[PDB]
Design a protein around this ligand. Structure first.
Ligand SMILES: CC(=O)N[C@@H]1[C@@H](O)[C@H](O)[C@@H](CO)O[C@H]1O
Ligand SMILES: *[C@@H]1O[C@H](CO)[C@@H](O)[C@H](O)[C@H]1NC(C)=O
Ligand SMILES: *[C@@H]1O[C@H](CO)[C@@H](O)[C@H](O)[C@H]1NC(C)=O
Ligand SMILES: NC(=O)CC[C@H](N)C(=O)O
Ligand SMILES: NC(=O)CC[C@H](N)C(=O)O
Ligand SMILES: NC(=O)CC[C@H](N)C(=O)O
Lengths: 446, 446, 446
């Protein structure tokens, strides 16, 4: 049969999408028959482990990749030409993030998710529970991101980021708060991207003395790219257990879709127009080429981002598929795509935009025109400061609301539905990188 | 004199064994005349320091060795031949560990250490003291070892391993336990062995691009091997203070040997037959060569393992003595011996076997035939999960006993005698590596 | 104009000294008009940030420099000649530190800072506040420094040093203290200097196998030296905010200079004679060359040490200025100057000498002749154990006083004036390195 020929050449494509629907059929049979209580907590961790093992070993290789592949990328061309590459790049990440957040106002206002329904029953969901939050100030977190760039110690920025807390050591009368930083747990991806680019330029200023050093990091880049190919074969096995592990936790067979299902359909549709109708239209307007043939070549990482629910996870998996399947250049694909891992959270700019209108569609708040331009520019700024940590964008939602002085009286409605909507967020998040990667292929042709 | 000629060529052999008996004569004069109280705690740390300095600097070089020497080892030969090297290897570590644990049942049953003596006075030793223990479940620790393999972050696995604890954040009615992991202190040796082997194969799949990279790690391996030679000369000084520091702590001039000295003679004899009568018989059955001439060439690391009481400590010291003194190959000795550091704790499979019969010889427990095959297969499994941390195998003793549902009413009798029996454990532990290393020299001759 | 020609060639010299006086004029206008309370604590951290950003990114490059530049330095020459370089070196650091501490007795006794003034009103300053201190014993901290050399783990010594605390887990009757170490936060500079020197010698014992490895670390050294040049241009901006941030904290417009201003003039004059009259006289006695033409070539790092107030901070900044401006050799300047970062705290030997006479000039204490030779040799020993941490030498002041059994009834007078006197300490501290660096240039001419 001739149909057997195309299936052998599309083996990873077929196995990935058949597994993401397998766990939904697997997990609903677990959640329906018996439920979460039938397994027991001492066995539930053993069930979710073959999915949780996937997210582990696929994360350990981004450290010898991102600090390594940006060297050989940003030391080939000249630093005068890198400004002709970088300035057109950061302009593109700013427009795509801002245009996605502009859809958030334009879709939530025309649908009004704060409608007369069970969603307005937030008093049963609030309970004063999530009020006990750190909720750092908007001046401090914006100051914290500039301090997270240019890290303190180079080894310490491989596993331990920087943040800030508050204390009250102020027995003087009128007890005030005092900021203090303590370097909490978490990998600093952004702190090492800005190091490797600056370190990559310094090898270009050197003459033939750096020729030994650049071929070292070129070879050490290539050995990791061999090792990411073997994890790619394991990836259809793990995604079957990512979805079928998370679905055991909550239930939406008539409970979660009943209360705030209008909001869920509001934000999934925000991911529907953007990145499936807008980004192909932008890509065709600059290339005049078929975007879906480009999009079909990248479907294993995009389905993996739905499973792993982390943009920083699926970073090496996309770097294999873009340079192999689609016709891009070797060196420039390994530069614009890793810097795009933590700079264009436009899904978060679409998630935190709608969710900040959603609580203001209810509870009778105006937002006529002055708050609209502030809620538009804040979400496209905090998206840069967001990490690739799963469910990390919920923490940056509270700093938008205080700056636009909306009530935070129940943030717990937007919370506890982010096991589903954030998986759609990462797919839209990582898609604009490779669409921007192929957009620079036409730019070098002229 | 002709006797002066052999002593100059056997200088390290003579100085090492004269120092391990020097500290016993030194420490008993300290423990006898004056005792531990005559020195004071502010001076006792200053006394144990020249031994404690030895265990420190000899441990800092295993990180630029194990992740480095396994690269140049497992990138020379073909990956098809590595399966012909690896499968025969892991079969040998399984048999030697299981045969050692089979001696534990066969020697404790024929001697019955739970005899009518002062050893049955465990009520004075129990006191409900060591009941306050974490004692993680057998399903979780077996799950934890698979998660400790394939580490989370590559830099973070150089000093910080992974484990798990328990919390009770369960105010819902019927308060249950919940697992949580927090990455406690401790070097992950096993997490980096599995990384370097996979990374070593990927250089072999590369062509001449990896030729620069393999010669880098070949040279960086050799510079450490120079530096381990200088610490080897310091090693007879330190072992004199390892033994004469630990002996100041407890006393066995008629007190510890009186109560449970039958148990101590039971487990030291278990280390006597295995690895001095069995392993020479296995080595002669496959080589038909003199095992003791091979064994005399490795006596400085084996006496160092008695002093340091850590298998992961004496790993670089054996790698010098095997490739220099005995006639083994250069590349294959630096592969099978580091992977054997944390895979064949057969002394622990002999220690945790007898100690789990010892508490069941007392307190009237049966173990007729069904528990015997479970207590045999559990100890040979948890020996793989054991670390090279001194006195680390005591924590893995409790997970055997709950799985074989024996009482843990006094584990503190097996505790606080492990300053002596565990030093015999590490000597038997590290011996089977080099005997297995020389066993593969005959395998390449055919 | 011909005066425009010299200003273009002295751009860094002119911009650095015009900024250290700019912040004094800036900060006094802030402290005078409005004061510290006019800004608010939520804005004060935003004001001090462009200075605090300078101290951050200029510290992240000392890890890929000190462990890297000492390799290519101490592997070129022979190890027989390194003893002819090292022994003359460590003799020079011992004399310069001891001669500086000899000035501390000779200047405090001839001035008597414990005079009838407001400085003797220490009862208002003591309050029993700083009595709650750890204050580890003199035998333990001297033992701790030898354990901090030869670190435990190589990766862990890049951000996490070693220290010791005390516990009282001693329910046996007569509750005593027990030492325990826990690896507190802080970069171990000294632990990696002793590693790279020993590792550098081992490459020299290797033949042409180390030729690949030495050219690797030679190139990786040079790429950092490019990157330190770009931070040097940012350095006149940051020092303007270092001084104008610290001056907002305290006030000395008639308050701090009134109470103990005799002591401040006593210790600043101790930094005046030493290192501006003594060290030029020593340098002229061995070179017969102009020391101030050598001293004018290094004025950007010396003014930076006044701003950063850390010897370990300004280590790469001096390594650029010495090898470029002044006529020293390339390889030997990158060896003696990094080892001099944490070995010759003679300012601390001048600070901790005077401050230990200052509390004994008051409160009627003798120190006739026997305590004088002990207070001289203790301060030159603890200066080696001092770190490059700002305000780190105050902790090592208490261990001098107990060994010379002077009262520690108010150490808080020497505390809280170290925002000013310690900035003079680091300038004198880092100056003797480069004066010692140029002193070895004449030694290689013969
Ligand atoms: C328990 C609960 O939420 N019940 C809701 C009620 O609050 C709401 O008013 C009504 C629609 O009007 O639907 C039902
Ligand atoms: C220990 O056990 C023996 C019996 O074997 C008994 O006679 C004795 O009283 C017990 N206690 C002590 C302190 O010896
Ligand atoms: C300071 O000391 C002087 C004596 O020299 C005394 O007259 C004055 O009252 C003291 N001031 C305070 C505040 O104690
Ligand atoms: N909510 C967010 O967008 C941040 C977390 C999300 N998983 C991401 O990596 O994009
Ligand atoms: N008790 C044990 O056997 C644990 C391992 C042992 N400390 C070793 O290094 O060999
Ligand atoms: N007072 C001191 O000596 C502390 C250390 C000093 N700040 C230095 O960097 O050398």
């Amino acid at each position: 049969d001739q149909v057997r020929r195309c299936l052998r050449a599309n083996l990873l494509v077929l196995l990935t999408v058949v597994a993401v629907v397998a766990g939904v059929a697997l997990g609903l049979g677990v959640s329906g028959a018996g439920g979460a209580l039938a397994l027991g907590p001492e066995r539930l961790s053993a069930f979710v482990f073959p999915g949780e093992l996937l997210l582990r070993l696929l994360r350990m290789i981004i450290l010898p990749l991102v600090v390594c592949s940006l060297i050989g990328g940003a030391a080939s061309l000249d630093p005068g030409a890198l400004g002709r590459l970088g300035a057109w790049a950061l302009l593109f990440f700013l427009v795509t993030t801002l245009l996605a957040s502009a859809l958030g106002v334009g879709l939530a206002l025309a649908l009004q998710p704060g409608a007369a329904s069970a969603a307005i029953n937030a008093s049963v969901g609030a309970a004063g529970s999530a009020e006990n939050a750190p909720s750092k100030e908007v001046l401090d977190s914006f100051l914290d991101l500039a301090r997270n760039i240019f890290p303190s110690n180079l080894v310490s920025a491989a596993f331990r980021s920087y943040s800030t807390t508050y204390e009250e050591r102020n027995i003087t009368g009128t007890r005030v708060k005092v900021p203090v930083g303590q370097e909490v747990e978490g990998m600093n991806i952004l702190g090492l991207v800005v190091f490797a680019i600056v370190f990559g330029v310094a090898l270009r200023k050197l003459g033939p003395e750096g020729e030994l050093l650049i071929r070292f990091f070129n070879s050490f880049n290539e050995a990791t790219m061999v090792l990411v190919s073997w994890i790619m074969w394991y990836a259809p096995v793990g995604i079957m257990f990512l979805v079928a592990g998370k679905i055991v936790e909550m239930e939406d067979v008539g409970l979660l879709f009943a209360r705030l299902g209008k909001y869920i359909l509001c934000c999934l549709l925000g991911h529907a127009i953007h990145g499936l109708l807008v980004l192909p239209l932008i890509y065709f307007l600059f290339t005049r080429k078929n975007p879906y043939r480009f999009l079909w070549g990248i479907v294993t990482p995009l389905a993996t981002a739905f499973g792993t629910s982390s943009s920083s996870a699926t970073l090496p998996l996309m770097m294999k598929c873009v340079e192999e399947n689609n016709g891009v250049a070797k060196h420039i694909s390994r530069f614009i795509l890793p810097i795009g891992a933590t700079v264009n959270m436009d899904g978060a700019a679409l998630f935190q935009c709608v969710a900040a209108v959603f609580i203001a569609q209810l509870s009778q708040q105006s937002l006529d025109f002055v708050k609209i331009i502030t809620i538009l520019v804040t979400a496209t700024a905090s998206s840069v400061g967001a990490a690739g940590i799963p469910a990390g964008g919920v923490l940056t939602l509270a700093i938008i609301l205080e700056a636009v002085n909306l009530p935070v009286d129940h943030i717990s409605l937007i919370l506890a539905v982010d096991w589903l909507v954030d998986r759609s967020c990462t797919v839209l998040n990582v898609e604009g990188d490779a669409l921007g990667a192929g957009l620079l292929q036409n730019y070098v042709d002229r």
